């Protein structure tokens, strides 16, 4: 009945040892310097009061990252012949560009929060330890670069280019631990990836030389393979298989037999080389993941053994039975454990061995700690609202709590949400037929949303906020119901013809999200257990790699906006001759940052990706431009996406043999 | 110095046991019935005289399979408005269509060889055993269907469709042992694969319904998502991302926020669901592969213990030391083994154990036979040309044989291989510049061909044809050098302006194929050892799986020609409005069998694959036409191609841990 942070900062050595093994099994790792020092009181107090505010730091980081969307592009600052206010001319829009004053205010606020966050942990780590670490130094470098940029911007109201987006993306990377771990893995994998890249490039060069020398006099040689550079470029694009029949169709028209060579190339290029690259990336990722897991387990073992050293006041590596029973009492005060009688532990010791005054040493204590952690479930925090026990223990409150804890409440929720799904289907079907009876079904939809809000409040009351927040699905349901109630009150408060809220259709999608929980019932059937379990495990586990890919996209988008900022115009004569106009892709240009993000995503799926390369190569006039696009394929598609595939396979196998071991 | 087949058919029990263990280790498995019967003399003689002619049966099988290419399409037999001789009108050609008399002659010859092959093994297997097996019955059914078809064709010179092309493909599947094993794998894998398709199809139905209801009144709803049937058709194509920006661009023009839904669907559809399908197919393949390997090893164990039963005339499960040494002398005649002294094996027994008259039991004879097999390399067949020992052991011949066996000769070939490459690159570069001095380099390029024949005859002479043919690498060089001399003698004999041979540019591609042996030297360096060794092993190992895909193409090609035979015409008005004409894809139609194979390959790589579905749906006029293309994608792309990706990953890992093992 004692909070963990308070137990660490204040209490008897038994309390501190119990809370340390608590933090270990929860997975949270204290800084090493705090462990090294003696009794770590004030430093732990500061560290806890700091980590209590993690939400504010995360929101600041996300705001700083998403500033890039609203920031005005550089090429617009240089005088364009039409003003940028003519939004249709440059094929862009749908986001408001921040003016100078708004930008400076936003940057100043974010910079202040970032500064206080970055210079907070000097308090407990200490002057000497803080400055020695590389991470603190690189973060301070990023912060000072941002600050000097803000200052010179303020004084401004010449630069070839601006450096803020790259540095803020980098500091966002260094902000989150998972992204740092992902970068460590990538740095591990780079050498082997480079070796495979060298082999692949050699294969492309050889195949391109063969294809060039084969069709030297053929009409298809005049049409496309005009030079060695051109044929190498076409062979690379064909290796991506984005345009299979297009490249070699004049050869097929001239003579059918030539097709054999091409069906000989792609077959080798796709089924052999690409799969070998995938296997290599899989192996490297597996080794690096094993390395990371071993490191994490080593850190956990180290800080558990530090806790054992803490409880051992004699520091002679000796633990007695009385100390063991006191520690067991502390943990069973925290965690759920079978009740122990005073004579019972003595009887257990006596029947255990005939040795007298047996010493429990360090390593078996650690191992027994992991055993008791894995065998026994965690015990919920008592409450946050229990400051008034009389209301907490009221008869009606007790009856309600007993009812909601019973599975009958879950069955009722399932029935309610199934009826909700039926109502949503009926309303949508009526909408399709343009019936005039939509309103009763829509108000039924709203009252269903109100029911969801009510049940969320009931559950968060009965379980307690921390225990409610602990479960993953509860967080998703919490966000969904909160956005539902916010939207509903926004619609109700204003009885006017709003653009979005007045329609009232939006609510259905939220309820559909609220009913994604249906898919969880499919874990019941044996056939689909592995698929659903692996998918649900994958989502939060695969968030960090997707975030790394997203940040790489952000960096490439900044580079592309900087380089190709103003090339696409309504009045550009060379543009209409390019393939973008023919396929009507003008809305996917690089004129502003959000458009850059969407076009980079389109390049990511490898769907008609060569049209952008060819069009921008014609538009800029230099072959070097393709470098950019080529780089995006080499770094992202060959490496990161193959890493994601490897992770999905590994997660599926882990779920599978876990299910087998369950039997 | 006794041939293995002769040893089995005639000889003492020691000879038969040695030859049986040799066959078991070599991997060749005798029929079970021959093992069951006593002493299996005449049956083994017939089986050997049969299996001696495996090349003829294989060539007959391949000729029967490739008959389909030259066979006239059915739709041409129906009277067309313009004659089929107008080859340009129907967008087809480049192969000669086999006339009636030629077709009947070819079919009769192939049928005769097939019939004698299929009815040969009744001789040794016996009447009751042969007819009971399912495989013999299905083969006989295929044969009788083919024969009755040939007979009714002969009598003809009404039918809605012809059944021959499907049958001769099936009889090709179960003629080859490797292709039979692959189908057994797919039968096991189909049960698990069907479960996932239910979830994948369910995900498509749900996602399509959301997209349909979201964009009901949107301008993008009018253009593409006009109905639920249409939106399900578009979302399915988007799942493969073959047309990513095309489908949802009217929505992006209306409101940029619409991209978020299409980004979400593609992200979850491609990165999560598609990879999970690969994980499921990988597992099912891995489990079934162990089922096949364990079954194969069980068959090897059974025949090995049969050899022990054969030598054990007492049939009491007893083997004595004096009996063991006689058998050991037989294997050391077949396999290389250290020389054993007569007194030595007596010393071996006493030091081994103090037991007297120790019995070597049935089981420990088996595992010991593998122990000798893996540690000791195979001993080559003495020779086939050694019928004249005086020439074989002549003074000059022995000196020559010593030189070629020595590694010094091997270096010279590699040195010659390099000098050839410089001659080729110099000769080709002159052609690029249209130099008039190409001929002097071209004739010097021929003489490198005669060297390659000279060393081929030199190598086959010292090793012997059976020992020469044993190595996989030697087989590749043997085929390459033979087409060189066959091609070269064609140009020399005819001093005329031939279409292909007179140019002389053909030899460089054969020479480039000959020096592919150089890439094997990259196995020396540690960085590329894993990549190259896996790739080389993949070429023979992946043939049965690639062969299975090719045969699936032959079945769809026959179906496509039957259904879509005459739809593509020069005079067809609806065709020019379709997407095929806009992209100029008319040469990839389904008019005849050779064209069908190429266009099916284009669907295999998933490159602009939707143009064929959409065009033929308009051309035929029924929505049932998409069934042919959707079924092809589901069976081939999702299952077969993922199986190949599963195999390449599996083959690579067994290569890495192999390399670790020698260390
Ligand atoms: Ca002590
Ligand atoms: Ca509507
Ligand atoms: Ca015996
Ligand atoms: Ca030429």
JSON list of N, CA, C and O in Angstrom, two decimals, chain A residues 485-525:
[
{"chain": "A", "resi": 485, "resn": "UNK", "atom": "N", "xyz": [-16.73, 11.87, -27.74]},
{"chain": "A", "resi": 485, "resn": "UNK", "atom": "CA", "xyz": [-17.45, 12.83, -26.92]},
{"chain": "A", "resi": 485, "resn": "UNK", "atom": "C", "xyz": [-17.08, 14.26, -27.31]},
{"chain": "A", "resi": 485, "resn": "UNK", "atom": "O", "xyz": [-17.94, 15.15, -27.32]},
{"chain": "A", "resi": 486, "resn": "UNK", "atom": "N", "xyz": [-15.81, 14.50, -27.67]},
{"chain": "A", "resi": 486, "resn": "UNK", "atom": "CA", "xyz": [-15.42, 15.83, -28.11]},
{"chain": "A", "resi": 486, "resn": "UNK", "atom": "C", "xyz": [-16.18, 16.22, -29.38]},
{"chain": "A", "resi": 486, "resn": "UNK", "atom": "O", "xyz": [-16.73, 17.32, -29.47]},
{"chain": "A", "resi": 487, "resn": "UNK", "atom": "N", "xyz": [-16.23, 15.32, -30.36]},
{"chain": "A", "resi": 487, "resn": "UNK", "atom": "CA", "xyz": [-16.97, 15.61, -31.57]},
{"chain": "A", "resi": 487, "resn": "UNK", "atom": "C", "xyz": [-18.45, 15.82, -31.32]},
{"chain": "A", "resi": 487, "resn": "UNK", "atom": "O", "xyz": [-19.07, 16.71, -31.91]},
{"chain": "A", "resi": 488, "resn": "UNK", "atom": "N", "xyz": [-19.04, 15.00, -30.45]},
{"chain": "A", "resi": 488, "resn": "UNK", "atom": "CA", "xyz": [-20.46, 15.12, -30.17]},
{"chain": "A", "resi": 488, "resn": "UNK", "atom": "C", "xyz": [-20.78, 16.46, -29.52]},
{"chain": "A", "resi": 488, "resn": "UNK", "atom": "O", "xyz": [-21.76, 17.12, -29.89]},
{"chain": "A", "resi": 489, "resn": "UNK", "atom": "N", "xyz": [-19.96, 16.88, -28.55]},
{"chain": "A", "resi": 489, "resn": "UNK", "atom": "CA", "xyz": [-20.24, 18.16, -27.89]},
{"chain": "A", "resi": 489, "resn": "UNK", "atom": "C", "xyz": [-19.97, 19.33, -28.83]},
{"chain": "A", "resi": 489, "resn": "UNK", "atom": "O", "xyz": [-20.65, 20.36, -28.76]},
{"chain": "A", "resi": 490, "resn": "UNK", "atom": "N", "xyz": [-18.99, 19.19, -29.72]},
{"chain": "A", "resi": 490, "resn": "UNK", "atom": "CA", "xyz": [-18.76, 20.22, -30.73]},
{"chain": "A", "resi": 490, "resn": "UNK", "atom": "C", "xyz": [-19.96, 20.35, -31.66]},
{"chain": "A", "resi": 490, "resn": "UNK", "atom": "O", "xyz": [-20.37, 21.47, -32.00]},
{"chain": "A", "resi": 491, "resn": "UNK", "atom": "N", "xyz": [-20.52, 19.23, -32.09]},
{"chain": "A", "resi": 491, "resn": "UNK", "atom": "CA", "xyz": [-21.71, 19.27, -32.94]},
{"chain": "A", "resi": 491, "resn": "UNK", "atom": "C", "xyz": [-22.90, 19.86, -32.20]},
{"chain": "A", "resi": 491, "resn": "UNK", "atom": "O", "xyz": [-23.65, 20.67, -32.76]},
{"chain": "A", "resi": 492, "resn": "UNK", "atom": "N", "xyz": [-23.09, 19.48, -30.94]},
{"chain": "A", "resi": 492, "resn": "UNK", "atom": "CA", "xyz": [-24.26, 19.94, -30.20]},
{"chain": "A", "resi": 492, "resn": "UNK", "atom": "C", "xyz": [-24.18, 21.43, -29.88]},
{"chain": "A", "resi": 492, "resn": "UNK", "atom": "O", "xyz": [-25.19, 22.13, -29.95]},
{"chain": "A", "resi": 493, "resn": "UNK", "atom": "N", "xyz": [-22.99, 21.93, -29.52]},
{"chain": "A", "resi": 493, "resn": "UNK", "atom": "CA", "xyz": [-22.90, 23.29, -29.01]},
{"chain": "A", "resi": 493, "resn": "UNK", "atom": "C", "xyz": [-23.23, 24.31, -30.10]},
{"chain": "A", "resi": 493, "resn": "UNK", "atom": "O", "xyz": [-23.83, 25.35, -29.83]},
{"chain": "A", "resi": 494, "resn": "UNK", "atom": "N", "xyz": [-22.86, 24.01, -31.35]},
{"chain": "A", "resi": 494, "resn": "UNK", "atom": "CA", "xyz": [-23.08, 24.95, -32.45]},
{"chain": "A", "resi": 494, "resn": "UNK", "atom": "C", "xyz": [-24.20, 24.44, -33.34]},
{"chain": "A", "resi": 494, "resn": "UNK", "atom": "O", "xyz": [-23.98, 23.51, -34.13]},
{"chain": "A", "resi": 495, "resn": "UNK", "atom": "N", "xyz": [-25.40, 25.02, -33.27]},
{"chain": "A", "resi": 495, "resn": "UNK", "atom": "CA", "xyz": [-26.49, 24.63, -34.20]},
{"chain": "A", "resi": 495, "resn": "UNK", "atom": "C", "xyz": [-26.44, 25.43, -35.50]},
{"chain": "A", "resi": 495, "resn": "UNK", "atom": "O", "xyz": [-27.32, 26.23, -35.82]},
{"chain": "A", "resi": 496, "resn": "UNK", "atom": "N", "xyz": [-25.38, 25.20, -36.27]},
{"chain": "A", "resi": 496, "resn": "UNK", "atom": "CA", "xyz": [-25.18, 25.91, -37.53]},
{"chain": "A", "resi": 496, "resn": "UNK", "atom": "C", "xyz": [-24.73, 24.92, -38.60]},
{"chain": "A", "resi": 496, "resn": "UNK", "atom": "O", "xyz": [-24.55, 23.73, -38.34]},
{"chain": "A", "resi": 497, "resn": "UNK", "atom": "N", "xyz": [-24.57, 25.44, -39.81]},
{"chain": "A", "resi": 497, "resn": "UNK", "atom": "CA", "xyz": [-24.21, 24.63, -40.98]},
{"chain": "A", "resi": 497, "resn": "UNK", "atom": "C", "xyz": [-22.69, 24.57, -41.12]},
{"chain": "A", "resi": 497, "resn": "UNK", "atom": "O", "xyz": [-22.08, 25.18, -41.99]},
{"chain": "A", "resi": 498, "resn": "UNK", "atom": "N", "xyz": [-22.08, 23.81, -40.22]},
{"chain": "A", "resi": 498, "resn": "UNK", "atom": "CA", "xyz": [-20.63, 23.63, -40.26]},
{"chain": "A", "resi": 498, "resn": "UNK", "atom": "C", "xyz": [-20.23, 22.75, -41.43]},
{"chain": "A", "resi": 498, "resn": "UNK", "atom": "O", "xyz": [-21.05, 22.01, -41.99]},
{"chain": "A", "resi": 499, "resn": "UNK", "atom": "N", "xyz": [-18.95, 22.84, -41.81]},
{"chain": "A", "resi": 499, "resn": "UNK", "atom": "CA", "xyz": [-18.47, 22.10, -42.97]},
{"chain": "A", "resi": 499, "resn": "UNK", "atom": "C", "xyz": [-18.44, 20.59, -42.72]},
{"chain": "A", "resi": 499, "resn": "UNK", "atom": "O", "xyz": [-18.86, 19.81, -43.57]},
{"chain": "A", "resi": 500, "resn": "UNK", "atom": "N", "xyz": [-17.97, 20.18, -41.54]},
{"chain": "A", "resi": 500, "resn": "UNK", "atom": "CA", "xyz": [-17.71, 18.77, -41.27]},
{"chain": "A", "resi": 500, "resn": "UNK", "atom": "C", "xyz": [-18.65, 18.17, -40.23]},
{"chain": "A", "resi": 500, "resn": "UNK", "atom": "O", "xyz": [-19.18, 17.07, -40.43]},
{"chain": "A", "resi": 501, "resn": "UNK", "atom": "N", "xyz": [-18.88, 18.88, -39.13]},
{"chain": "A", "resi": 501, "resn": "UNK", "atom": "CA", "xyz": [-19.62, 18.30, -38.01]},
{"chain": "A", "resi": 501, "resn": "UNK", "atom": "C", "xyz": [-21.11, 18.22, -38.31]},
{"chain": "A", "resi": 501, "resn": "UNK", "atom": "O", "xyz": [-21.80, 17.33, -37.80]},
{"chain": "A", "resi": 502, "resn": "UNK", "atom": "N", "xyz": [-21.63, 19.14, -39.12]},
{"chain": "A", "resi": 502, "resn": "UNK", "atom": "CA", "xyz": [-23.07, 19.21, -39.34]},
{"chain": "A", "resi": 502, "resn": "UNK", "atom": "C", "xyz": [-23.58, 17.97, -40.06]},
{"chain": "A", "resi": 502, "resn": "UNK", "atom": "O", "xyz": [-24.73, 17.56, -39.85]},
{"chain": "A", "resi": 503, "resn": "UNK", "atom": "N", "xyz": [-22.75, 17.36, -40.91]},
{"chain": "A", "resi": 503, "resn": "UNK", "atom": "CA", "xyz": [-23.19, 16.17, -41.64]},
{"chain": "A", "resi": 503, "resn": "UNK", "atom": "C", "xyz": [-23.51, 15.03, -40.69]},
{"chain": "A", "resi": 503, "resn": "UNK", "atom": "O", "xyz": [-24.52, 14.34, -40.85]},
{"chain": "A", "resi": 504, "resn": "UNK", "atom": "N", "xyz": [-22.65, 14.81, -39.69]},
{"chain": "A", "resi": 504, "resn": "UNK", "atom": "CA", "xyz": [-22.87, 13.76, -38.72]},
{"chain": "A", "resi": 504, "resn": "UNK", "atom": "C", "xyz": [-22.46, 12.37, -39.17]},
{"chain": "A", "resi": 504, "resn": "UNK", "atom": "O", "xyz": [-22.60, 11.43, -38.39]},
{"chain": "A", "resi": 505, "resn": "UNK", "atom": "N", "xyz": [-21.96, 12.22, -40.39]},
{"chain": "A", "resi": 505, "resn": "UNK", "atom": "CA", "xyz": [-21.54, 10.91, -40.86]},
{"chain": "A", "resi": 505, "resn": "UNK", "atom": "C", "xyz": [-20.29, 10.43, -40.12]},
{"chain": "A", "resi": 505, "resn": "UNK", "atom": "O", "xyz": [-20.15, 9.23, -39.85]},
{"chain": "A", "resi": 506, "resn": "UNK", "atom": "N", "xyz": [-19.41, 11.36, -39.75]},
{"chain": "A", "resi": 506, "resn": "UNK", "atom": "CA", "xyz": [-18.10, 11.01, -39.19]},
{"chain": "A", "resi": 506, "resn": "UNK", "atom": "C", "xyz": [-18.23, 10.00, -38.06]},
{"chain": "A", "resi": 506, "resn": "UNK", "atom": "O", "xyz": [-17.41, 9.07, -37.96]},
{"chain": "A", "resi": 507, "resn": "UNK", "atom": "N", "xyz": [-19.26, 10.14, -37.23]},
{"chain": "A", "resi": 507, "resn": "UNK", "atom": "CA", "xyz": [-19.37, 9.33, -36.02]},
{"chain": "A", "resi": 507, "resn": "UNK", "atom": "C", "xyz": [-19.27, 7.85, -36.36]},
{"chain": "A", "resi": 507, "resn": "UNK", "atom": "O", "xyz": [-18.61, 7.08, -35.65]},
{"chain": "A", "resi": 508, "resn": "UNK", "atom": "N", "xyz": [-19.84, 7.44, -37.50]},
{"chain": "A", "resi": 508, "resn": "UNK", "atom": "CA", "xyz": [-19.87, 6.01, -37.82]},
{"chain": "A", "resi": 508, "resn": "UNK", "atom": "C", "xyz": [-18.47, 5.43, -37.83]},
{"chain": "A", "resi": 508, "resn": "UNK", "atom": "O", "xyz": [-18.22, 4.39, -37.21]},
{"chain": "A", "resi": 509, "resn": "UNK", "atom": "N", "xyz": [-17.52, 6.14, -38.44]},
{"chain": "A", "resi": 509, "resn": "UNK", "atom": "CA", "xyz": [-16.17, 5.61, -38.53]},
{"chain": "A", "resi": 509, "resn": "UNK", "atom": "C", "xyz": [-15.59, 5.37, -37.15]},
{"chain": "A", "resi": 509, "resn": "UNK", "atom": "O", "xyz": [-15.02, 4.30, -36.88]},
{"chain": "A", "resi": 510, "resn": "UNK", "atom": "N", "xyz": [-15.80, 6.31, -36.23]},
{"chain": "A", "resi": 510, "resn": "UNK", "atom": "CA", "xyz": [-15.31, 6.11, -34.87]},
{"chain": "A", "resi": 510, "resn": "UNK", "atom": "C", "xyz": [-15.91, 4.85, -34.26]},
{"chain": "A", "resi": 510, "resn": "UNK", "atom": "O", "xyz": [-15.18, 4.01, -33.71]},
{"chain": "A", "resi": 511, "resn": "UNK", "atom": "N", "xyz": [-17.23, 4.66, -34.40]},
{"chain": "A", "resi": 511, "resn": "UNK", "atom": "CA", "xyz": [-17.83, 3.43, -33.88]},
{"chain": "A", "resi": 511, "resn": "UNK", "atom": "C", "xyz": [-17.24, 2.21, -34.56]},
{"chain": "A", "resi": 511, "resn": "UNK", "atom": "O", "xyz": [-17.01, 1.18, -33.91]},
{"chain": "A", "resi": 512, "resn": "UNK", "atom": "N", "xyz": [-16.96, 2.30, -35.87]},
{"chain": "A", "resi": 512, "resn": "UNK", "atom": "CA", "xyz": [-16.30, 1.18, -36.52]},
{"chain": "A", "resi": 512, "resn": "UNK", "atom": "C", "xyz": [-14.96, 0.89, -35.87]},
{"chain": "A", "resi": 512, "resn": "UNK", "atom": "O", "xyz": [-14.65, -0.27, -35.57]},
{"chain": "A", "resi": 513, "resn": "UNK", "atom": "N", "xyz": [-14.19, 1.94, -35.57]},
{"chain": "A", "resi": 513, "resn": "UNK", "atom": "CA", "xyz": [-12.97, 1.74, -34.81]},
{"chain": "A", "resi": 513, "resn": "UNK", "atom": "C", "xyz": [-13.28, 1.13, -33.45]},
{"chain": "A", "resi": 513, "resn": "UNK", "atom": "O", "xyz": [-12.60, 0.19, -33.02]},
{"chain": "A", "resi": 514, "resn": "UNK", "atom": "N", "xyz": [-14.33, 1.62, -32.79]},
{"chain": "A", "resi": 514, "resn": "UNK", "atom": "CA", "xyz": [-14.70, 1.08, -31.49]},
{"chain": "A", "resi": 514, "resn": "UNK", "atom": "C", "xyz": [-15.04, -0.40, -31.58]},
{"chain": "A", "resi": 514, "resn": "UNK", "atom": "O", "xyz": [-14.97, -1.13, -30.59]},
{"chain": "A", "resi": 515, "resn": "UNK", "atom": "N", "xyz": [-15.40, -0.87, -32.78]},
{"chain": "A", "resi": 515, "resn": "UNK", "atom": "CA", "xyz": [-15.77, -2.27, -32.94]},
{"chain": "A", "resi": 515, "resn": "UNK", "atom": "C", "xyz": [-14.64, -3.11, -33.52]},
{"chain": "A", "resi": 515, "resn": "UNK", "atom": "O", "xyz": [-14.86, -4.29, -33.80]},
{"chain": "A", "resi": 516, "resn": "UNK", "atom": "N", "xyz": [-13.44, -2.55, -33.69]},
{"chain": "A", "resi": 516, "resn": "UNK", "atom": "CA", "xyz": [-12.33, -3.40, -34.09]},
{"chain": "A", "resi": 516, "resn": "UNK", "atom": "C", "xyz": [-12.10, -4.51, -33.09]},
{"chain": "A", "resi": 516, "resn": "UNK", "atom": "O", "xyz": [-11.59, -5.59, -33.45]},
{"chain": "A", "resi": 517, "resn": "UNK", "atom": "N", "xyz": [-12.53, -4.31, -31.84]},
{"chain": "A", "resi": 517, "resn": "UNK", "atom": "CA", "xyz": [-12.38, -5.33, -30.81]},
{"chain": "A", "resi": 517, "resn": "UNK", "atom": "C", "xyz": [-13.06, -6.63, -31.20]},
{"chain": "A", "resi": 517, "resn": "UNK", "atom": "O", "xyz": [-12.70, -7.70, -30.68]},
{"chain": "A", "resi": 518, "resn": "UNK", "atom": "N", "xyz": [-14.05, -6.59, -32.11]},
{"chain": "A", "resi": 518, "resn": "UNK", "atom": "CA", "xyz": [-14.67, -7.83, -32.56]},
{"chain": "A", "resi": 518, "resn": "UNK", "atom": "C", "xyz": [-13.62, -8.83, -33.03]},
{"chain": "A", "resi": 518, "resn": "UNK", "atom": "O", "xyz": [-13.72, -10.02, -32.72]},
{"chain": "A", "resi": 519, "resn": "UNK", "atom": "N", "xyz": [-12.60, -8.35, -33.75]},
{"chain": "A", "resi": 519, "resn": "UNK", "atom": "CA", "xyz": [-11.65, -9.27, -34.35]},
{"chain": "A", "resi": 519, "resn": "UNK", "atom": "C", "xyz": [-10.94, -10.08, -33.27]},
{"chain": "A", "resi": 519, "resn": "UNK", "atom": "O", "xyz": [-10.50, -11.21, -33.52]},
{"chain": "A", "resi": 520, "resn": "UNK", "atom": "N", "xyz": [-10.86, -9.54, -32.05]},
{"chain": "A", "resi": 520, "resn": "UNK", "atom": "CA", "xyz": [-10.18, -10.26, -30.98]},
{"chain": "A", "resi": 520, "resn": "UNK", "atom": "C", "xyz": [-10.89, -11.56, -30.64]},
{"chain": "A", "resi": 520, "resn": "UNK", "atom": "O", "xyz": [-10.22, -12.54, -30.28]},
{"chain": "A", "resi": 521, "resn": "UNK", "atom": "N", "xyz": [-12.21, -11.61, -30.77]},
{"chain": "A", "resi": 521, "resn": "UNK", "atom": "CA", "xyz": [-12.93, -12.86, -30.53]},
{"chain": "A", "resi": 521, "resn": "UNK", "atom": "C", "xyz": [-12.47, -13.97, -31.47]},
{"chain": "A", "resi": 521, "resn": "UNK", "atom": "O", "xyz": [-12.63, -15.15, -31.14]},
{"chain": "A", "resi": 522, "resn": "UNK", "atom": "N", "xyz": [-11.88, -13.63, -32.62]},
{"chain": "A", "resi": 522, "resn": "UNK", "atom": "CA", "xyz": [-11.43, -14.66, -33.54]},
{"chain": "A", "resi": 522, "resn": "UNK", "atom": "C", "xyz": [-10.23, -15.42, -32.99]},
{"chain": "A", "resi": 522, "resn": "UNK", "atom": "O", "xyz": [-9.82, -16.43, -33.57]},
{"chain": "A", "resi": 523, "resn": "UNK", "atom": "N", "xyz": [-9.65, -14.96, -31.88]},
{"chain": "A", "resi": 523, "resn": "UNK", "atom": "CA", "xyz": [-8.64, -15.77, -31.21]},
{"chain": "A", "resi": 523, "resn": "UNK", "atom": "C", "xyz": [-9.23, -17.06, -30.65]},
{"chain": "A", "resi": 523, "resn": "UNK", "atom": "O", "xyz": [-8.50, -18.01, -30.37]},
{"chain": "A", "resi": 524, "resn": "UNK", "atom": "N", "xyz": [-10.56, -17.10, -30.47]},
{"chain": "A", "resi": 524, "resn": "UNK", "atom": "CA", "xyz": [-11.18, -18.29, -29.90]},
{"chain": "A", "resi": 524, "resn": "UNK", "atom": "C", "xyz": [-11.01, -19.50, -30.81]},
{"chain": "A", "resi": 524, "resn": "UNK", "atom": "O", "xyz": [-10.66, -20.59, -30.34]},
{"chain": "A", "resi": 525, "resn": "UNK", "atom": "N", "xyz": [-11.24, -19.33, -32.11]},
{"chain": "A", "resi": 525, "resn": "UNK", "atom": "CA", "xyz": [-11.13, -20.45, -33.03]},
{"chain": "A", "resi": 525, "resn": "UNK", "atom": "C", "xyz": [-9.67, -20.81, -33.24]},
{"chain": "A", "resi": 525, "resn": "UNK", "atom": "O", "xyz": [-8.78, -19.94, -33.25]}
]
